[PDB]
Symmetry: none
């Protein structure tokens, strides 16, 4: 999906920011961070999770071709979130996602204005950034974040209120932490996010009718061994990110 | 210089503009006409002659996937007059790019307003459609011209100025009037606009002592049969344009 | 099918064979002549009429990347007369494909021997070139013809038989003689071999009650200007062959 | 090289062999095994080790667009063992290339015959299937190796001979056994065949007096986390290979 956005490490560390003067150590902090206002400055205009992830790849992949060394990242979200929030059924205005920005961005600075010198180059650059983004993202409109199946595997397999309830949450975090966006397809990235529930509670969901593994539904190539490796990797960003890690450090304190 | 902008019939014979219900002559009118809101529009902006020619090139291509009924050149022209502008190191303001359209399209309706929805509405559109064209040409800014060669070709051979004018002046017709931009190459178009005046003035340029001809310098592929072969279409393409033709005919009234 | 077969007029007159030093008419002389080692050869093998036509399509195509100077048609034909065969659900023996060449090429030397040093040597060559062409053509077996339309088209409009013959025969000149295969599409070439015979017999097809013409049904893009242009070009291209023309003129000496 | 050749992991799970009916380990068994019919097979053709190394590369890529079920390595090796040959200045005869297969594959069946249908038949195949791959590989004969770096890298630091051997020798397993050819780059493969002996031999090569490491010279993209990632991966990849692992391991037993 579509196998153009998924390349080996050849283009992982080859990213514009991974060679245009930004140490790899300074990328999963740049992404996340700017991906933290997405889930907040976005999580405001009743933005569905739908609208939050679309813009979570509308930055990851956008900066995939672009750079931070010449683009307002924190103020690029309006760009990723202009097409994102607009693409999804509930689009918005030129200010709605740019006024609260001043909230989330400038939590102290004075009020903004439509007449003020501000709101001009904001509705200049940002308004034009929309031009500057789609064309790198080939004008596409197809993005199925690894969820739809995770939200589809629950029932038919008959999960519970603590495993399937734990399912929603692993996909998202893989959108605000790991680079599985432009490396692993949404399905394969689902068996892992579903895996971190039973790889937690040890709820090894029994085989299928004919001794078939549950990770064969979200994809036909999802293998245990590889899948094992893909969740462990998730134990890489969580292991050190001292911000959200503590969230899941205790967020599992209220299902049972 | 690029293959994706050379097409069989493909002519425009079965363009997307065909598919809806628009006469071949109409889209043929649409194009040439569309240049009038671009040639006579950029004439207001005091832009470089070459600055506009590149613009017509975009419109001709832009509608090679779209349609004139849905996306009217009426507004499309200033859109293409932005990508070309910047590229030729002297662009203009999106508001003046639009502040030429009003006086050009509606030269009687009151002046437009910077703080009206009727301006702000199309405000993002000229930077949204600017993308719709920005990508439609596969971000292919690089475009060769039948003018530069005409210079050297008539300068290397010691052609006169009054005739030289006929060389350049004819170049301006391949784009606006005809669609030679999408049918032939710049080193093969300049050889048409030269073998057309050669008759008009009743000339014959004494050539090479090497054994080659002068239509071989701009291009060693160019032919003579085709030179006349195209001259017939070329002339004919203005031979049925009773608007732009005569004005060309009158341009040669105070010539001799 | 798509493109890369439908070369431009620019992309034909300056073929890779051009680059060495071969006249457009000469390579055009080579072609048709090379085509003679394909229809008047396959006429020996009792192969399907369309089975050979496709080969000239292969021969015509093969030289769109190669040369007549390197690979002389003399030997390429049995190669292209092999790809066509198999493709047509009916191949031929590698010895019989080659035991057709001698009697055509060398009609004077005593019979060849399968166990002679003169035979084993060139043995791989018909199995070497067959790959050079098999793979250059992207294993594109699927190729349509301007006959199948020619058939129905003259039945669907109720054209006569004698004229219909005049239709079919004309395909063998559009392909063998001209290079319309690489300039237009089968539904748009057959209308040239039909709008050329249509006159010869002195006909006029009563048409549509909507206001459209009969060249618009088989193809809604086709034109008359273009139709006559190509019937004219076609005819004109035969005004430069007083060799096969007369033979063409004599072919209806019994049918006049 | 050069692009479109390195696949992802899940993409390396979802091989063509999956869709037909081959176990993930099974297709993996085919490959490595097929490499045994390239090394100890070409050793009969006496060809250069690097002449064979290129051969495995073609097989490894070939089946990411073909299949192991249809096209058996039994003949696929001599077919790919021909493209490598010629590409190296010293190829071998089409008759011997296959008359090396028999003596390797069937060391009991009677000697082959030059004038046998069993010889003439697979004669055309080795020039037909050679074409299927000539086209399959996007005519990319050019393929780089994880050796070239290993040499210089061990020269630039002045490494010893015993250690170097461990470097070079290890490259030859990176190809045959694993699929690093479609997963990694030569400047990232040579760094794997070095980071394995570094442990095996008990080494660590002090480098550059800038503060930088040596895995930045062979490749400025390479990582240490990744270095173990593959070095760990590798080790496992031979653990499942109880054949070539020991055979590699025993080389350091007869190595004194």
């Amino acid at each position: 999906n579509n196998k153009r956005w998924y390349f080996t490490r050849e283009q992982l560390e080859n990213s514009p920011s991974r060679r245009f003067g930004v140490d790899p150590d300074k990328e999963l902090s740049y992404r996340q961070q700017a991906a933290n206002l997405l889930q907040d400055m976005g999580q405001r205009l009743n933005v569905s999770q739908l609208t939050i992830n679309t813009a979570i790849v509308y930055m990851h992949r956008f900066y995939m071709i672009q750079s931070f060394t010449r683009f307002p990242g924190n103020s690029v979200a309006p760009a990723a979130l202009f097409l994102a929030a607009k693409v999804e059924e509930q689009p918005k205005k030129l200010e709605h996602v740019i006024k609260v920005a001043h909230t989330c961005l400038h939590p102290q600075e004075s009020l903004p204005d439509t007449r003020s010198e501000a709101y001009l180059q904001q509705v200049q650059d940002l308004v034009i950034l929309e031009s500057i983004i789609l064309q790198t993202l080939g004008f596409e409109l197809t993005i199925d974040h690894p969820h739809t199946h995770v939200v589809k595997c629950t029932q038919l397999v008959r999960a519970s209120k603590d495993l399937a309830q734990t399912s929603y949450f692993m996909a998202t975090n893989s959108l605000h932490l790991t680079t599985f966006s432009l490396q692993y397809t949404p399905p394969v990235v689902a068996c892992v996010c579903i895996h971190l529930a039973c790889k937690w509670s040890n709820w090894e969901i029994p085989v299928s009718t004919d001794g078939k593994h549950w990770w064969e539904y979200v994809d036909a190539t999802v293998t245990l061994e590889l899948l094992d490796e893909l969740t462990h990797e998730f134990l890489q960003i969580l292991e050190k990110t001292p911000n959200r890690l503590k969230r899941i450090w205790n967020w599992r304190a209220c299902e049972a």
